[PDB]
Symmetry: D2
Subunit: 247 residues, 4 copies
């Protein structure tokens, strides 16, 4: 049974990915930062449908917690075949001229540094250079990497631009080691994330901006993530897959 670790697996895109991955036969490590109840609910659904899963707490911005999380996965599920770097946050609407260092630090440490750290630990386990059997990593970026989120969260957009470049660089770096590395760029998706930044109606309000005239679902994003993870995408690496309704 291949093992997949999903950071921020407890809600939204991460939860939809967890559920779909399990339907495809992965054992799933569902990471959460504090919402144990949500993570337990994803695990419950997986198990009730006949799959294997484990909820694992860690703040991906904390190196010791990332290490412990991977050790737990090693011990309880086995060596991972797949990693989804989904953990990520927005913040309140801001202009750059209102940005604090503390805001930037948080934005980048979760969205960017967490993805580097989880990828480090994944590569160490996966790479054929270390006797691993290879694997697949999907980073969750955003259309914002291309659009810049002006007047909303240019910092978030920049963090996602870092993720796009990271994706390409890491892909090239491990391409001989049996590892593929890709990113999905979701557009406006129906999740709690918009409410977390003070804009609970954002999916509805911005739908007229999207060429397809609706927000996307978490499940739609999960489909792209799980495709990239799997063997049907065996010559795809360094790809940036837009899931945006045309945005």
């Amino acid at each position: 049974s291949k093992v997949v670790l999903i950071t921020g697996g407890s809600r939204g895109i991460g939860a939809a990915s967890a559920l779909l991955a399990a339907r495809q036969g992965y054992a799933v490590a569902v990471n959460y930062a504090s919402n144990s109840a949500a993570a337990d609910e994803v695990v419950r659904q997986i198990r009730e449908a006949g799959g294997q899963a484990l909820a694992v707490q860690a703040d991906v911005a904390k190196e010791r917690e990332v290490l412990a999380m991977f050790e737990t996965v090693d011990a309880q599920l086995g060596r991972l075949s797949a990693l989804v770097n989904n953990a990520g946050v927005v913040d309140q609407t801001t202009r750059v001229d209102g940005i604090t260092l503390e805001r930037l630090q948080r934005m980048f440490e979760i969205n960017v540094f967490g993805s580097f750290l989880c990828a480090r630990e994944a590569v160490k386990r996966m790479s054929t250079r270390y006797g691993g059997s290879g694997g697949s990593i999907v980073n969750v970026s955003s259309a914002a990497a291309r659009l810049g989120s002006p007047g909303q969260y240019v910092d978030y957009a920049a963090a996602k631009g870092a993720i796009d470049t990271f994706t390409l660089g890491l892909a090239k770096e491990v391409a001989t080691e049996g590892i593929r590395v890709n990113a999905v760029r979701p557009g406006i998706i129906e999740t709690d994330i918009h409410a977390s930044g003070g804009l609970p109606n954002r999916a509805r309000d911005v739908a007229p901006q999207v060429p397809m005239q609706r927000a996307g679902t978490a499940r739609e994003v999960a489909e792209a993530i799980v495709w990239l993870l799997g063997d049907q995408a065996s010559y795809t690496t360094g790809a940036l897959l837009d899931v945006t309704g045309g945005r």
Copy 2:
């Protein structure tokens, strides 16, 4: 009966692999070819022997009356299409820009670009919910060359593929309210006959060391990306450019 897919240049290579895979997924397949009827017939035979439905349809996609007749044949014999794969395409001999003739350019663009526009036109007319269709999906076959430029080899080909990338984005945005998705795959160096057709039969092997994954791709690997994009799992994906390149 089931959903219908028209695959231009379906007789060989990436097109043929896509035709076989699409049929496995339940599509009825129109396998277009320009001249190699035997190859097309063989793809059709394989599909039918596995219980699928397929028809071989001759057309040079650079010829308007032939594109129209091809769509009319599909309409009559298979039904209203749900999907189009604009795969037909060609390379030409190694050249620098300073050696390019107008005749070469005309050929390169009329097959690789004009053909894809004409076929998309006819597909949209049938698929669009504005015209009483039920929507559909179009996949254009681009290339990594669209990003890289094929210097000293075929900058004209690469430019034709750059046009396809932009056409993909423009058309996707234009028909997004009409139940149609439009996406492109960008293959890298793939094991097909195309390299031999331009005088470089060993190109897949020779260029493999340049690819981060250190091998050429297979037509089946490109077909997988094509068929994924065509299907309902890619339901919020439109205007995407999906690299199938081993990192190149």
Copy 3:
């Protein structure tokens, strides 16, 4: 006195580039397709300001006319140092489902083929492989190459996408031969082109969509063209320089 050939130099961006190039010390060949009066007026203005210039007729889609034009430039001005591939057209507003082959043929033969043909002739003269002293080529692309002109002229956008990739390919191809090749991507510019496609108010109507909230001037595009041509851009080749007000 370095010699520059400007395709479609009689009006709009081409004319602005011609006037600016002359101010910088180029002798200018002002190409036109049929508006001899406009070309003669640009030449008159150049000469009045102390520069050298010649009007030269040619439809860039016609190989024989491109050859005759370069031969005239050779004879009357001397061997070119610089080429601006500016000649270009739009057409009426259309959807793809309304596009005819005849429209496509025109769009591409002027916007794409003409650029390749003029580049071919320029390279034959400029390349150090053939005993030339190098040179610089600027192609005029568009923001449409990135945005796609949906519901307006996807065919035009696609032609400009071809130009972007042509720019990169050709730049890489001739990089050791003393030749730089770059592209400017203008946004919405105040010229006659919008009227030629049946939308005379387009610069004004689309301005609210542009982040800077106005259309650009032909002079603003000419500044970028002439910078890329000259020696201050000596390490810049294969670049796509957006002149779009943020669009």
Copy 4:
């Protein structure tokens, strides 16, 4: 009188070349440095000896209080800035991702990314017409790495520069009505020989990058905002 430009990391390399060129164009130049006061003083000496105005200003751009103090110094001694070049930046030793530490990442991003955000914040506050300013221009210094990814060398650096590209675009669009333009230059391999991985077969010079920076800063680039200008020899 003279427009004022603040150049972060102005004491050496691209920043120093930009300082010298900007002065030749008539800017008064604030030359920022983190610790190499001697180099910064030398740039200032050259500017002044050629008849320009300049001031060396110490600040670690990753430190908010130091960024604030620096802008306050420029306000007091040179006047309200018209231009900002976010050039301060570092690489680190060659590494794979599987060898990257959090401490490395923290440094890489705080200097290359957070410093650029903080300096742009303070610049926008002074420049924006919405606060009574007269507008201005910001050039960020990115890298070809933003597109290429620096595999097996420094993916972290490449990622930081990718952040700068998106920041550029986002900020440009955010302040476009406020008289502010925001652009980036993406240098390739720049010398401190044949350079075989560059199409042009040589490294670029700091002066070549400075030329592009100063062009973008000036009024000839008046409809250019959100652009990414490659100075890479085709890389």
